[PDB]
C-alpha cells in the first residue's frame, strides 16, 4: 500500500531551426488520471490555429482560430478569421470576422480591432542591467468595432436586453466584468495580475446590413498587468510577424472524460527560439499566464508526474547551461526526465513559475 | 499519513417529493487552518412554513462555538418568502453572544437577485447550465437595541466614522469580511459593491435606544457564486411541506478535524429535465471556499458515499461510477470516487452527476 | 405497512397505509394515481384541469377536497408529457435530454420516448410541476 | 385508429411482454438501451407512427408496472384493463369464539 499516487504522463518534443530562423516544431502529449475541475463533464475540444503571411510590405498576417468543443453533450464551436498587423511598434491593428455556434444557435461577427500595449516605464537601467527581464508592467487598450447581424430571435433579444441595461443601469461599465468572466475566469484574472478597467462604450446602434439588421458595438476596455501578463509583458514578441515567412499551424485538443485529461498538442510557429546575446540562443522563457492559470486546477490532486522533454537542435548547435541538466544526449537531441526535471514539471503543473532556461549556440 | 475518513449518506424520497436524509461524517487527522484553536462549533438549522398561502417560512439557525475557550453563540430566526420570481423578502430577529457580551438584533431585509441575461439559446442548448452570472441587491433594515455601554460605544463610533470619512462605503468591506473572507470573496467570483448607508438613526424603543440602520449592497457573481446562479434552487419554499432540519458542527483541535452533519430538507434531488431526476449540482462556493484550506496537507482519503434511492428508482450516468450496489443502496468508494473526493476537498469543481429516475 | 416490516429506507411517500392495500385497486400504485388529461381555456383565462384516474372511470377536477387528499399522501397526479395541452416543447425537451445518454441503435427510441412527470401542491401556487430545475405551475405557465 | 396506447418510459421495466403481443407487420414497440440493462436501461417505446391501435399490447393484461396506458379517444387515460374496486378493509376478529380479539 501507498499514498494516493495519481500518476500523470506527458512527453514534449521541440525541434528548432538554425541561423536567424526562430521556428520550432513543438509536439506535446499528456495524460493525467485525475478528475478535471470542470462543472460540466465530459469536455472535449479541438483547437486549430492557422497562420499565413498576407503581405510583408507593412505586416498583414492572416490568422485563423477554430475551436470545436463538446461539453456535456453541448456542441460548441467558434472560428475567428482575422487580419492582424503591427501598424506601429507600440500599436497593433486587426480586421477580422468569425462565428460562434452552440448547439443549434449560431451568430456571425465581423470586427475591426486595435490594441495599444503601453509599458509604464522604459528605463535603460533595467534593459542593460537585467539580461533576462521577465516581468514588465504595462497596459493594453482594446478598441473593437464588432458588427453582429441580428437574424435570430435570441440575437435580437440580446440586443435590446443589452441596450436596456446600458440605458437603465449606470453601473453596466463595470458590472459587465462579472458576466464577461464566466465562473473562475474572474478568479484567474487576479492570479495573473490582470486588472480589467471598466469598459467604455462609444455607442450601440443597428443599421440595415446586406441582408438584415446588424448590431454594431463600439467599445473600449483596458487591462493592466503586474508582470505575469504575457499578453502585456511580452507583447512585442508574442506576435512574430516580421520573422514569419511561411504558414504557421498549431493543432491542440484535450479529452476531459471526468476520469482524466488526455492532451494532444502540435505546433509550427516562429519565435520558439529567442536570442540571448553573443551568438547564444534560448528557448523562449516560459509564459507566466499559462502556468499561473493552470495552477488553479493542478493543485486538487497530488500526482507523481512522469515527464519527458525532447529538444532537437539544428546541425552544429550545442546546448549549454540547461537547468535542470539534460538527462541524456543522443548526438544532437537532448532529453529531460526524472530527478530535478520531473520536480520542475510538477512545480509548473501546480502553478509554479520556476526558471527552466535552455541556452544553445554553435 | 494524514488519512481523511469520511462517510456520506444520501437517502432520497420519491414521487414529486425532492426531500432527502443527508448525514455525513468526517475525521481528518490534520491541523485546521484556524489562527485560533481549538475551534469547536455546533450549528443547528430549522425551517417550517408559516403560511404557504404567500410563502413565509420560519427558518431558525443557532450557531454555538467555542474558539480558544471563547463561547460564541449566534441565534437567528427569519420569515423568508419569495415575493417575486426574482425578489425575496424576509423579516426576523436574533442575538449574538460572545462570552459575557451579548447584543440582540431584529431586522427586515429584501434581497433582489438579477441575472445579466435571460437568453433562451443558452437554455435550449445547455441542458445543465452551471455558471450563471448575476447580481444580488440586498436591502437590509436592521434594528439593534443599545443596552450595554459597548453597544453605545459601537453605535457612536460608527456614526462618527460615517460622518467623518467619505470612504466608509468601501472601507467597510475590510471590516465586513474579517480575515481570509476577503480572499474567499474574490476566489468565489463574488464582488461586494460599496454599501449605500441610507441612514443611521437611533430612537428610544420599548426599554431604551435602538440603533436602526438602513443600508444596502449589491454583491455580484462571475457564475460560481451559489447565492446568484442558483437563486431559485437554494430556497425551495414551494416544495417545503414539513419542518426541515440540518444539524452540523465540528469538533476541531490542533491535531485533528472531526465533522458530523445531519440533514432533512427538500432540494436534494432536482429534476434534471423531462422527468429525469438528479442529485442537485454540487454547490460550488463551499468547494472553492474549502479550496484555500483543504490544500495545506496531502491526505489519504477513504470516502464512502451511500446514496439510497427510493423504491423503483434506478440510476443512469453515475460519473464516477458507483462502486457497489444493493438495489437502492448505491455506494461510491475508492477508485475514481475517492479521487474525485480528494479533488473536491482540495478545492476542485469537477462534476459528479447522479442522474436517477424510476 | 409497519416501519419495522418494510425495507429500511422507506419514506411515507412509499409506505402505504390500508395494510391490505395492494388488492384494493391496482397493485402497481400504492396511492391512487390520477392523470392530467386535458387543460383547456374557456371564456376567462382560467384553465380547466381534468383529473381522470388511472382506472379511467371518472373525470374529476383538482378541487379543494382532492387537493387535501393529495397533501395528505393518499393520491398522486401525473401529466403524461405527450399531453396535447402542453406549453413547453416536450418533444424537443425529451429528445435533447435523451441525446445526452441514449445511443439510437434503433434510431427511433428517443423520438418516441414519453414519460410521466409528477405534480405537487404547495398552496400559494396551485398544482405546480417542477421540471428541468424550474417550478412550473399548471395555472398558466405549464398548462 | 383512435385510443392510442403509448408506453411510459418511467414505469416500464422493458420486459417486452407488450412487444410480444405487437403484430410483427407493425413494429410499433421497440427498445432503447442508453446503458446497462441490469439497471432498467432497456425501456420500451411505442412508435405512434407505426401503431395501428390493435389493443393487443394493453388488452393482453401483462404490463407489470402499468406503463401501458391506452389514452381514450377523448381524454381518459387507463392503466390496466380492469382495476379492483378500491375497497375499505379491516380484520374481522370475533369476540369469544374463533377469535377472542384482545
Amino acid at each position: 500500500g501507498s499514498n494516493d499516487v495519481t500518476t500523470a504522463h506527458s512527453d514534449y518534443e521541440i525541434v528548432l531551426e538554425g541561423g536567424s530562423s526562430s521556428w520550432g516544431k513543438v509536439k506535446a502529449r499528456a495524460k493525467v488520471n485525475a478528475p478535471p475541475a470542470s462543472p460540466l463533464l465530459p469536455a472535449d475540444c479541438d483547437v486549430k490555429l492557422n497562420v499565413k503571411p498576407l503581405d510583408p510590405a507593412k505586416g498583414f498576417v492572416r490568422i485563423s482560430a477554430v475551436f470545436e468543443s463538446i461539453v456535456d453533450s453541448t456542441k460548441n464551436k467558434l472560428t475567428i478569421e482575422a487580419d492582424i498587423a503591427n501598424e506601429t511598434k507600440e500599436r497593433r491593428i486587426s480586421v477580422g470576422e468569425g462565428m460562434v455556434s452552440v448547439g443549434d444557435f449560431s451568430h456571425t461577427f465581423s470586427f475591426e480591432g486595435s490594441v495599444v500595449n503601453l509599458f509604464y516605464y522604459r528605463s535603460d537601467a533595467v534593459r542593460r542591467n537585467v539580461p533576462n527581464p521577465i516581468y514588465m508592467q504595462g497596459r493594453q487598450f482594446h478598441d473593437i468595432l464588432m458588427k453582429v447581424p441580428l437574424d435570430n430571435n435570441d440575437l435580437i433579444d440580446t440586443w435590446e436586453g443589452t441596450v436596456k441595461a446600458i440605458g437603465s443601469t449606470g453601473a453596466f461599465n463595470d458590472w459587465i466584468r462579472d458576466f464577461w468572466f464566466i465562473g473562475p475566469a474572474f478568479t484567474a484574472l487576479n492570479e495573473g495580475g490582470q486588472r480589467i478597467s471598466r469598459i467604455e462604450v462609444n455607442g450601440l446602434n443597428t443599421e440595415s446590413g446586406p441582408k438584415g439588421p446588424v448590431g454594431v458595438s463600439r467599445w473600449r476596455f483596458s487591462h493592466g498587468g503586474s508582470g505575469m501578463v504575457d499578453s502585456i509583458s511580452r507583447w512585442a514578441e508574442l506576435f512574430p510577424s516580421d520573422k514569419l515567412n511561411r504558414p504557421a499551424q498549431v493543432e491542440a485538443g484535450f479529452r476531459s472524460d471526468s476520469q482524466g485529461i488526455e492532451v494532444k498538442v502540435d505546433g509550427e510557429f516562429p519565435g520558439v527560439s529567442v536570442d540571448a546575446g553573443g551568438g547564444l540562443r534560448r528557448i523562449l522563457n516560459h509564459p507566466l499566464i499559462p502556468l499561473v492559470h493552470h495552477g488553479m486546477v493542478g493543485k486538487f490532486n497530488n500526482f507523481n508526474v512522469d515527464a519527458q522533454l525532447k529538444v532537437v537542435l539544428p546541425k552544429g548547435y550545442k546546448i549549454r547551461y540547461a537547468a535542470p541538466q539534460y538527462r541524456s544526449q543522443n548526438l544532437e537531441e537532448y532529453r529531460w526526465s526524472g530527478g530535478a526535471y520531473a520536480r520542475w514539471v510538477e512545480h509548473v503543473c501546480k502553478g509554479g513559475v520556476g526558471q527552466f532556461e535552455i541556452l544553445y549556440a554553435q | 499519513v494524514t488519512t481523511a475518513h469520511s462517510d456520506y449518506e444520501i437517502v432520497l424520497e420519491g414521487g414529486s417529493s425532492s426531500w432527502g436524509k443527508v448525514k455525513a461524517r468526517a475525521k481528518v487527522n490534520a491541523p485546521p487552518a484556524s489562527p485560533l484553536l481549538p475551534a469547536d462549533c455546533d450549528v443547528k438549522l430549522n425551517v417550517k412554513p408559516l403560511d404557504p398561502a404567500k410563502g413565509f417560512v420560519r427558518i431558525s439557525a443557532v450557531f454555538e462555538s467555542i474558539v480558544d475557550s471563547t463561547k460564541n453563540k449566534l441565534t437567528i430566526e427569519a420569515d423568508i418568502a419569495n415575493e417575486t420570481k426574482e425578489r425575496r423578502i424576509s423579516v426576523g430577529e436574533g442575538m449574538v453572544s460572545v462570552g459575557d457580551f451579548s447584543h440582540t438584533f431584529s431586522f427586515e431585509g429584501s434581497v433582489v437577485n438579477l441575472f445579466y441575461y435571460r437568453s433562451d439559446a443558452v437554455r435550449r442548448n445547455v441542458p445543465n447550465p452551471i455558471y450563471m452570472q448575476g447580481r444580488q441587491f440586498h436591502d437590509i433594515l436592521m434594528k439593534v437595541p443599545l443596552d450595554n455601554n459597548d453597544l453605545i460605544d459601537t453605535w457612536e463610533g460608527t456614526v462618527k466614522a460615517i460622518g467623518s470619512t467619505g470612504a466608509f462605503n468601501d472601507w467597510i468591506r475590510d471590516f465586513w469580511f474579517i480575515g481570509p473572507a476577503f480572499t474567499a470573496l474574490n476566489e468565489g467570483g463574488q464582488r461586494i459593491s460599496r454599501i449605500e448607508v441610507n441612514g443611521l438613526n437611533t430612537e428610544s424603543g420599548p426599554k431604551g435606544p435602538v440603533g436602526v440602520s438602513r443600508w444596502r449592497f449589491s454583491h455580484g457573481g462571475s457564475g460560481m457564486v451559489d447565492s446568484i446562479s442558483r437563486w431559485a434552487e437554494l430556497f425551495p419554499s414551494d416544495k417545503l411541506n414539513r419542518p426541515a432540519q440540518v444539524e452540523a458542527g465540528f469538533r476541531s483541535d490542533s491535531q485533528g478535524i472531526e465533522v458530523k452533519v445531519d440533514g432533512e430538507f427538500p432540494g436534494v434531488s432536482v429534476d434534471a429535465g423531462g422527468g429525469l431526476r438528479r442529485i442537485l449540482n454540487h454547490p460550488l462556493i463551499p468547494l472553492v471556499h474549502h479550496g484555500m484550506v483543504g490544500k495545506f496537507n496531502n491526505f489519504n482519503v477513504d470516502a464512502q458515499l451511500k446514496v439510497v434511492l427510493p423504491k423503483g428508482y434506478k440510476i443512469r450516468y453515475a460519473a464516477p461510477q458507483y462502486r457497489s450496489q444493493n438495489l437502492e443502496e448505491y455506494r461510491w468508494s475508492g477508485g475514481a470516487y475517492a479521487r474525485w473526493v480528494e479533488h473536491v476537498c482540495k478545492g476542485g469543481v469537477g462534476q459528479f452527476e447522479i442522474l436517477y429516475a424510476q | 405497512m409497519q416501519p419495522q416490516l418494510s425495507r429500511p429506507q422507506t419514506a411515507s411517500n412509499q409506505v402505504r397505509k390500508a395494510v391490505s392495500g395492494p388488492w384494493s385497486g391496482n397493485a402497481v400504485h400504492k396511492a391512487e394515481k390520477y392523470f392530467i388529461t386535458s387543460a383547456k381555456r374557456d371564456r376567462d383565462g382560467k384553465l380547466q384541469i381534468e383529473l381522470v384516474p388511472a382506472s379511467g372511470r371518472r373525470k374529476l377536477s383538482p378541487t379543494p377536497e382532492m387537493i387535501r387528499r393529495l397533501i395528505d399522501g393518499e393520491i398522486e397526479i401525473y401529466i403524461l408529457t405527450t399531453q396535447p395541452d402542453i406549453a413547453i416543447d416536450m418533444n424537443k425537451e425529451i429528445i435533447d435530454m435523451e441525446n445526452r445518454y441514449v445511443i439510437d441503435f434503433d434510431k427511433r427510441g428517443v423520438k418516441w420516448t414519453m414519460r410521466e412527470i409528477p405534480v405537487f401542491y404547495h398552496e400559494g401556487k396551485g398544482l405546480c410541476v417542477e421540471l428541468h430545475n424550474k417550478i412550473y405551475t399548471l395555472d398558466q405557465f405549464f398548462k | 385508429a383512435k385510443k392510442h396506447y403509448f408506453i411510459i418510459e418511467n414505469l416500464c421495466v422493458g420486459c417486452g411482454l407488450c412487444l410480444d403481443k405487437c403484430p410483427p407487420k407493425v413494429n410499433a414497440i421497440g427498445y432503447k438501451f442508453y446503458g446497462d440493462v441490469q439497471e432498467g436501461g432497456f425501456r420500451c417505446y411505442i412508435d405512434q407512427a407505426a401503431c395501428i391501435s390493435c389493443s393487443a399490447c394493453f388488452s393482453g393484461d401483462e404490463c407489470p408496472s402499468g406503463a401501458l396506458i391506452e389514452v381514450l379517444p377523448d381524454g381518459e387515460v387507463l392503466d390496466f384493463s380492469y382495476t379492483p374496486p378500491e375497497r375499505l378493509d379491516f380484520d374481522l376478529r370475533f369476540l369469544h369464539r374463533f377469535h377472542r380479539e384482545a
Binding site: P42, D44, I70, D72, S73, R255, D257, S258 | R316, Y317, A318, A319, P320, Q321, Y322, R323, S324, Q325, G335, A336 | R100, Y101, V102, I103 | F33, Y34, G35, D36, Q38, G41
Partner: peptide, 15 residues
Amino acid sequence: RRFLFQRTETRSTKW
C-alpha cells in the same frame, strides 16, 4: 458522441 459511449457503459468498478 464520445460522451455517449461513456454514458452507455455498464458499471466497470466491480471488485
